């Protein structure tokens, strides 16, 4: 557990994630605060989104608990920061690193999946009125994800 977590942390340190920066909170290895940079050619642009990662005691045999802290207007992310990611609930295997999870979350931010949504109203707006969805996403990422 501890050795695997430190190996992942060192791997992150050796090769910078460029678009991400994860590190332990204080000195606790089972609580990380990660940062994600919004994709440039998306409404979530010029934005900094903070995520909290809680490694379970049985890591890597149980999925880490990843929750958004910054408010985001996304069909697959609710108000509590819960992320509709398949690799975090039942598809988890002891072979996925935190860098892979961050890349998956960045891809999710790149394009939502409204056919299996978590916030039905946002998904409905996205499917029906695309321009209003874009405007709302830009407003939210300007109000919350900046400063």
């Amino acid at each position: 557990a501890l050795k695997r977590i430190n190996r992942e942390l060192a791997d992150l340190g050796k090769d910078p994630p460029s678009s991400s920066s994860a590190g332990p909170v204080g000195d606790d290895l089972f609580h990380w605060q990660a940062t994600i940079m919004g994709p440039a050619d998306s409404p979530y642009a010029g934005g900094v989104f903070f995520l909290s990662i809680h490694f379970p005691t049985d890591y890597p045999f149980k999925p880490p608990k990843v929750n958004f802290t910054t408010r985001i207007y996304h069909p697959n992310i609710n108000s509590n920061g819960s992320i509709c990611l398949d690799i975090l609930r039942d598809q988890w295997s002891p072979a996925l690193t935190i860098s892979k999870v961050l890349l998956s979350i960045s891809s999710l931010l790149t394009d939502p999946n409204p056919d299996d949504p978590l916030v039905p109203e946002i998904a409905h707006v996205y499917k029906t009125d695309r321009s209003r969805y874009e405007l709302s996403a830009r407003e939210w990422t300007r109000k919350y994800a900046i400063g």
Partner: protein
């Protein structure tokens, strides 16, 4: 009329119909020695109609070797008479009687007949009658480290269930015209060739919805075939298939016929030539007993062994057995003829009780027909076993001394064990230890720890407890009961009510552990198992793990420096459903049950906690405004539960329950259908509500409907409990109050700055001040499945069934809802007995100090199919460090409480390794990539001081060591694993 309050765990293994049929069967038991009493105990706990005992032989001292209902005051009294009184107390629904004489015709009164400690002629006489009258006949025998079971249920036994697995069911994607049924994406049907299935909710092929079973021809992990469906239709879309289980006919042979041509059951495939030897050996034993006035061969006597071998030769010649007799094994059987071990008795008693249940309930696949077992690997080899040492000493341990000898008895009597948990396995382990004489010497001792209390449902498989003991601590009751069984254990047993975990290290510290000899786990969760395994690995103590699940069981042994630990193996984790599936799109009853549990927690538990915390913590609002993920939710909960919706009577509680019904079963569904209409399509043009997504429909409140009324009653009762009001159950008040209710209008909303903080502040200041409410608290609802008067399971069942009605899912009853929501683990008394027997058979190996890894056996078994298997433990992995052989698990570094710099220099100069990471507990003490200033501040500090500074908590006075995890790189930069560090404070 099954008392589900007592058979709660057993019904999940057998079922309602099985137990109903079981409660109409009579069981006769011939022989009341250790095996007979074990069988009777298991049967009585099972719940048969009644039990009758027959054993007129007067008691003898040696009989106490494995009979735990006999005391030294009963010498000279018939065993049945002195055992019936104690057996009658186990279960109040199962009368126990005694018969002084047996007549053949009398046997017609019983459904099953179990025979032990009976000569072969009498067994033949009994079987010749019980076979032709269709009476199940089971014969069991235990000789030292050997055991035999024989079953005969008649010529036309009907077995309804042959494996005990639930019928297989699944969701279909498409069925071609040629019967090719395909499962959904990434879904395995699991069917096997020749199975029968029935289809329902099939679109495009209505003919398959009739329900007639059809043959299955598996074509792959995702597809199978059913034959030709040409007439019914061309292609079928979606639908659900469910397996159908057909009864099987099993034909048994009588004992007289089966003696010549037996049909064996092999408990292990590594030794397949033995059962033919035991078949001759046991018959030779019977002949020898008949030829010496029922006197078995004396322990470790050569003359008797030779005579027994001559009898074996004669029998083999007579029966035309074309098998060469193994002289060593047969003479070993001769030596241990008079042995009587409590472990073997427990194992065979569990097995035979399960066979009795199979005979009565016509369930599971029975043994067919001979089952010969031996644990000869357990015979000690580090002590002297001979005629002089094994002769009886006129004590209650003669049955065990006849197998192990006096020196091994002295070794056992000085053990210092540590038992974790006091559940069913704990009770069986304590019984076995008391019978074996464990820790009865001057230097012996026993320690048992368990923080739980006795409950009604626990009495079904924990025979050391009685209804008068409900509500008391398990450890004290178990210790007192075992002290009663064996008086010599008076003062040698200590009972703790402490949970084994990080917080109890002040009690189970270095001093406590250094004196132990072995640790035995009887836990039911993986966290505690892992913790105890880590403690044993650190302290290098033998560990005995055992687990059960329904009729399945396993036992594992961990030996220092020999095998791997418990944590080196990974088990499948719990399945958690995606949040999106639960929140909006459920398709199975499990999803609705999980949603109902979440609703219960969010309605009756979390808002109450928030209200209580607001009235206690002076600075709760400010902390919540910037700490919680939804301060507005917390403020709204506080307002609603304090001022806005505070009930003044139970009528207001009923109105609130009605409002919540509308909120959760009528309005949210309308909103969802407004966002995604039933005719909407996905981005690819496919219909949205297709496949795993079922279109919901809002519910209209009908008071006459049962489910609606149940939900209203449960919600109102729980709300009244929260506010401490007087609830009621008469339907008249509910019907009167709900008649005058006007539903507020609701229309789905299409949607379409910093003032929000101002609104939050306005809400906050609108709340009453904490000073105005002193001494006022709201009682939260803590989930409790085992109580049927708190409306918890009732509410969960009602909510789950209502949501199932929303999505057209088949509702479940309160039984299945309690099983799913409560995470109830099915349990049986027979499985517990078997695992205890196996663990106690490994315990003697541990005591003897066996070194080779081939002499230990991890065991697995499934009693639903009569499967037993044993495999050698996995050796601990080795590694190369600095050109030396290091054990990955059982090796460590011992260092003083030196400074961090000194530790790094030691690892550099001694092991030639560069330290890159050093951590203790859950804190990162040192990392190679930290800024130089931090390291220069931390380098010259001692390890203890560094840990205290980083963890911000002083070390406890009882702390005597530190366990450090270190990751280091070699000279070339290649990562090399190293064992942990044991800093001595």
């Amino acid at each position: 009329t099954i008392d589900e309050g007592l058979y709660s765990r057993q019904l999940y293994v057998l079922g309602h119909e099985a137990m109903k049929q079981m409660s109409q069967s009579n069981v006769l038991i011939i022989g009341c020695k250790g095996l007979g009493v074990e069988i009777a105990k298991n049967v009585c706990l099972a719940g048969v109609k009644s039990v009758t005992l027959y054993d007129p032989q007067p008691t003898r001292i040696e009989d106490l070797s494995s009979q735990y209902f006999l005391t030294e005051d009963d010498i000279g009294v018939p065993r049945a008479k002195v055992t019936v009184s104690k057996l009658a107390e186990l279960n109040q629904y199962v009368p126990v009687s005694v018969v002084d004489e047996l007549s053949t015709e009398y046997l017609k009164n019983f459904k099953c007949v179990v025979v032990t400690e009976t000569s072969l002629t009498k067994q033949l006489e009994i079987n010749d009658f019980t076979h032709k009258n269709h009476i199940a006949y089971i014969a069991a025998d235990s000789r030292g480290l050997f055991g035999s079971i024989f079953c005969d249920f008649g010529e036309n036994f009907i077995c309804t269930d042959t494996d005990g697995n639930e019928p297989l069911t699944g969701m279909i994607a498409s069925i071609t015209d040629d019967g090719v049924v395909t499962m959904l994406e990434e879904t395995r049907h699991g069917l096997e060739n020749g199975d029968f299935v029935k289809f329902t909710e099939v679109k495009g092929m209505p003919g398959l919805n009739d329900g007639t079973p059809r043959k299955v021809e598996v074509k792959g992990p995702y597809t199978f075939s059913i034959g030709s469906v040409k007439d019914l239709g061309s292609a079928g879309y979606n639908g659900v298939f469910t397996q159908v289980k057909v009864p099987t006919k099993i034909s048994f042979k009588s004992l007289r016929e089966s003696l010549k041509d037996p049909e064996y059951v092999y408990p292990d495939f590594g030794k397949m030539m033995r059962p033919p030897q035991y078949h001759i050996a046991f018959q030779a034993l019977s002949a020898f007993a008949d030829a010496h006035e029922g006197s078995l061969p004396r322990p470790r006597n050569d003359i008797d062994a030779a005579e027994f071998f001559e009898f074996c030769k004669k029998i083999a010649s007579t029966l035309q057995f074309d098998v060469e007799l193994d002289e060593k094994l047969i003479k070993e059987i001769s030596y241990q003829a008079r042995g009587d071990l409590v472990a073997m008795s427990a194992f065979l008693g569990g097995a035979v009780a399960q066979e009795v249940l199979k005979a009565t309930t016509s369930k599971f696949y029975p043994l067919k027909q001979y089952f010969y077992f031996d644990s000869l690997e357990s015979l000690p080899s580090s002590v002297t076993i001979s005629e002089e040492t094994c002769k009886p000493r006129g004590c209650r341990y003669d049955g065990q001394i006849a197998v192990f000898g006096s020196e091994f008895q002295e070794k056992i009597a000085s053990l210092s064990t540590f038992l974790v948990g006091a559940g069913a396995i704990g009770c069986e382990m304590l019984k076995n230890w008391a019978m074996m004489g464990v820790a009865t010497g001057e230097s012996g001792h026993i320690s048992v720890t368990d923080m739980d209390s006795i409950e009604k449902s626990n009495l079904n498989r924990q025979f050391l407890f009685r209804p008068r003991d409900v509500g008391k601590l398990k450890s004290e009751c178990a210790s007192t009961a075992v002290s009663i069984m064996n008086p010599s254990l008076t003062g040698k047993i200590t009972s703790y009510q402490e949970r084994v975990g990080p917080e109890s290290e002040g009690i189970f510290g270095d001093e406590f552990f250094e004196k132990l000899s072995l640790v035995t786990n009887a836990l039911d969760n993986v966290e505690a198992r892992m913790y105890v395994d880590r403690r044993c690995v650190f302290f290098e103590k033998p560990l005995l793990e055992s687990g059960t699940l329904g009729t399945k069981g396993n036992t594992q042994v961990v030996v220092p420096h020999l095998t791997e630990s418990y944590g080196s193996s990974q088990d499948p984790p719990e399945k958690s459903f995606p949040i999106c599936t639960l929140k909006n799109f459920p398709n199975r009853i499990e999803h609705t049950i999980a949603w109902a549990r979440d609703l219960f927690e969010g309605l009756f538990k979390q808002p109450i906690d928030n209200v209580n915390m607001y009235l206690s913590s002076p600075n709760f609002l400010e902390t919540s405004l910037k700490t919680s993920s939804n301060p507005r939710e917390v403020l709204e909960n506080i307002r609603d539960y304090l001022v806005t919706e505070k009930p003044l009577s139970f009528e207001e509680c009923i109105m609130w329950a009605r409002l919540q019904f509308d909120k959760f079963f009528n309005n949210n569904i309308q909103q969802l259908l407004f966002n995604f209409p039933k005719d909407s399509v996905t981005s690819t043009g496919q219909p949205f509500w297709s496949g795993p997504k079922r279109a919901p429909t809002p519910l209209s409140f009908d008071i006459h409907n049962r489910e609606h009324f149940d939900f209203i009653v449960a919600a109102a009762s729980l709300y009244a409990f929260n506010y401490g009001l007087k609830s009621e159950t008469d339907p008249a008040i509910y019907e009167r109050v709900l008649a005058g209710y006007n539903p507020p209008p609701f229309a789905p909303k299409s949607g379409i700055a910093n003032k929000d903080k101002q609104e939050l502040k306005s809400i906050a200041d609108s709340l009453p001040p904490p000073s105005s409410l002193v001494g006022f608290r709201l009682t939260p609802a803590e989930f409790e499945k085992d109580d049927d008067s708190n409306h918890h399971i009732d509410f969960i069942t009602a909510a789950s069934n209502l949501r199932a009605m929303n999505y057209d899912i088949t509702p479940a009853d309160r039984f299945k809802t309690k099983f799913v929501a409560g995470k109830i683990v099915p349990a049986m008394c027979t499985s517990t007995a078997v695992v205890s027997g196996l663990v106690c058979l490994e315990l003697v190996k541990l005591v003897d100090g066996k070194k080779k890894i081939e002499e230990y056996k991890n065991g697995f078994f499934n009693l639903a199919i009569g499967l037993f298997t044993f495999s050698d433990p996995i050796a601990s992995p080795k590694m190369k460090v600095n050109g030396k052989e290091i054990d990955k698990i059982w090796d460590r570094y011992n260092l003083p409480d030196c400074t961090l710099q000194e530790l790094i220099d030691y690892f550099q100069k001694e092991e030639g390794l560069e330290v890159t990471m050093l951590s203790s507990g859950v804190s990162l003490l040192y990392a190679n990539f930290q800024p130089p200033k931090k390291l220069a501040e931390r380098l010259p500090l001692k390890i203890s001081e560094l840990v205290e500074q980083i963890t911000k908590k002083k070390l406890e006075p009882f702390r005597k060591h530190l366990v450090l995890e270190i990751c280091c790189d070699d000279a070339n930069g290649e990562d090399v694993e190293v064992p942990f560090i044991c800093i001595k404070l």
